[PDB]
């Protein structure tokens, strides 16, 4: 249970990590930018999250 809970809790915490994007919340990238600038920023979060 501890190994699964440490594996899930780290997987969840990593949603909040930047990977070099202007925000670790996707709706902040979408609200502050147009698509030509968003695809440079979202690909950071995809490359990281994945």
């Amino acid at each position: 249970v501890n190994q699964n809970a440490q594996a899930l809790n780290t997987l969840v915490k990593q949603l909040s990590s930047n990977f070099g994007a202007i925000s670790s919340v996707l709706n902040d990238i979408l609200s502050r930018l147009d698509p030509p600038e968003a695809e440079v920023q979202i690909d950071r979060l995809i490359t990281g999250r994945l």
Binding site: I22, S31, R32, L33, D34, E37
Partner: protein, 49 residues
């Protein structure tokens, strides 16, 4: 302490440039900021870059 319709600046033909570095400019009409700070000055053209 105010409401900022950025389109008033963004549609203005007076500007030689409208550079943005953490947003794309139409979104300035949708966002909300805790403060804005306007640094203001006059400079030669070959160093506006």
């Amino acid at each position: 302490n105010c409401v900022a319709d950025y389109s008033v600046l963004y549609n203005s033909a007076s500007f030689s440039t409208f550079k943005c570095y953490g947003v794309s400019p139409t979104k300035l009409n949708d966002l909300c900021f805790t403060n804005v700070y306007a640094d203001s000055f006059v400079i030669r053209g070959d160093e506006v870059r």
